[PDB]
């Protein structure tokens, strides 16, 4: 394989989040400088939203009209619920930058376009991605991910039909073991069509999964092991999360 694994360690969470944010600003500018646009997939969770606040601090460096935004997963709950990933991203960053709404592609909410139809909502997002993957090869420039201690990424949990999905780009998860139970999630084939996949991971509880995933486990057991970019996979980790490497 010619897809390299990059591990960048920082001393703690604050240092990690600041560094990941800076890296993302530089990545967006490079993509724009090389191809005239950038396509980024956002994630939820503490570190994933935290790095967006750092991006905001440097937002003036980027022409946001050339940036296209997707999400790797979303809680299928009402639009204004605090559990929404898109809502947190908007407050951290998106509400504060001049990015055209047609460039920002949030997954549906349960009081949204599709009503409470989780399956229909995931299918709608999958049709959206299909247009993407046919204009741009590969699809995304950077897919950001958080990872849980059991190795889950997006809403792909161990042993599930979602992590086993080899065809559909997006599926509904109606039974997440972490609340809330209903999520919309990109599958591994979608994650894998990114130039780079970046997992930003902090804490001692994540150390076993980091080591298993870097070491190349079966993704059905450790979903993060299948979260690999076409050009590189970048682990932005703190020292605690790196302790089993």
132 belongs to an annotated ligand binding site? no
147: buried, middle or exposed (CB in 10 Å: 19+, 13-18, 0-12)? buried
Instruction: Please choose, from the candidates 187, 194, 198, the residue with its C-alpha nearest in 3D space to the C-alpha of residue 132.
Output: 194
Annotated ligand binding at 68? The verdict is yes
Cα 140 to Cα 42, 121, 161, 217, 229, distances in angstroms: 11, 21, 24, 24, 10
How far is 207 from 237, CA to CA, in rounded Å? 9
Q: Is 91 annotated as a binding residue?
A: no
**H or E segment and range at residue 228:** none
Any known ligand binding at 143?
no
Q: How many CB atoms lie within 10 A of CB 52?
A: 24
Sign of torsion, CA 168 184 6 158? negative
Among all chains, which residue has been given the structure tokens 């109606």?
174
Rounded Cα gap, residues 200 and 235, in angstroms: 6
- Please measure the distance between the N-terminal and C-terminal CA atoms of the chain and give it in whole angstroms: 21
The sign one gets for the Cα dihedral 23, 25, 28, 30 is negative
Give the tokens for residue 26: 């530089």
Spatial contact of 232 and 196, defined as CB atoms under 8 Å apart: yes
Please name the helix (run of DSSP H) or strand (run of DSSP E) that holds residue 143, with its range, or none.
strand 140-145
Strand partners, 41: 70, 143
Task: Determine if residue 4 is labeled as part of a ligand binding site.
Answer: no
Q: Checking DSSP bridges between strand 73-75 and strand 183-186, what pairing results, if any?
A: antiparallel
Q: To what resolution in angstroms was this structure determined?
A: 1.8
238 among annotated binding-site residues: no
236 DSSP β-pair partners: 8, 200
Could you tell me if residue 121 is left (phi over 0), alpha (psi between -120 and 50 degrees) or otherwise beta? alpha
Does 12 appear as a known binding residue? Answer: yes
Count structural domains, the chain: 1
Q: Has 80 been labeled as part of a binding site?
A: yes
* Alpha helices, DSSP H, located in the chain: 13-35, 46-57, 85-92, 118-135, 161-164, 188-191, 207-214
Residues 205, 206, 212, 217, CA torsion sign? positive
Q: Is 105 labelled as part of a ligand binding site?
A: yes
What CATH number is associated with residue 165? 3.40.50.1360
The DSSP line for 23-83 is: HHHHHHHHHHHHHS-EEEEE--SHHHHHHHHHHHHTGGGS-GGGEEEEESEEE-S-TT-TT
117 annotated to bind ligand: yes
Experimental technique: X-ray
Give bridge partners of residue 9 from the DSSP assignment.
237
Residues 6+ away with beta carbon under 8 Å from 43: 71, 72, 73, 85, 144, 145, 146, 154, 200
Residue range of the domain that includes 76: 1-245
Alpha carbons 207 and 205: distance in angstroms, whole number: 6
Q: Which residue has the tokens 């997002």?
A: 125
Residues 6+ apart with CB under 8 A from 89: 42, 44, 49, 52, 71
Sheet hosting strand 140-145, strand order edge to edge: 4-10, 232-238, 194-201, 140-145, 38-42, 67-71
Is 82 assigned a ligand-binding role in the annotation? no
């Amino acid at each position: 394989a010619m897809s390299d694994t990059v591990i960048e360690r920082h001393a703690d969470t604050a240092a990690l989040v600041a560094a990941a944010g800076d890296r993302l600003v530089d990545a967006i500018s490079s993509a724009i400088g090389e191809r005239g646009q950038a396509t980024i997939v956002l994630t939820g969770g503490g570190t994933g939203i935290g790095l967006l606040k750092r991006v905001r601090e440097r937002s003036g460096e980027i022409d946001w009209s050339k940036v296209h935004i997707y999400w790797g997963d979303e809680r299928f709950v009402p639009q204004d619920d605090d559990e929404r990933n898109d809502k947190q991203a908007r407050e951290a960053l998106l509400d504060h930058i001049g990015i055209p709404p047609v460039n920002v592609h949030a997954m549906a909410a349960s009081d949204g376009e599709f009503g409470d139809d989780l399956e229909a909502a995931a299918a709608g997002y999958a049709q959206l991605l299909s247009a993407d993957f046919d204009s741009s090869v590969p699809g995304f420039d950077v897919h950001l991910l958080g990872m849980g201690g059991e190795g889950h990424v997006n809403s792909l949990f161990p042993d599930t039909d979602a992590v086993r999905e080899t065809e559909r780009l997006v599926v509904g998860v109606s039974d997440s073991p972490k609340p809330p139970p209903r999520r919309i999630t990109l599958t591994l084939p979608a994650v894998q069509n990114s130039r780079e996949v970046w997992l930003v991971v902090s804490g001692e509880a994540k150390a076993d999964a980091v080591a298993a995933a870097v070491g190349g486990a079966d993704p059905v057991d450790i979903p993060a092991a299948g979260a690999v970019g076409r050009e590189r996979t970048v682990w932005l980790v703190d020292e605690a999360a790196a302790a089993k490497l």
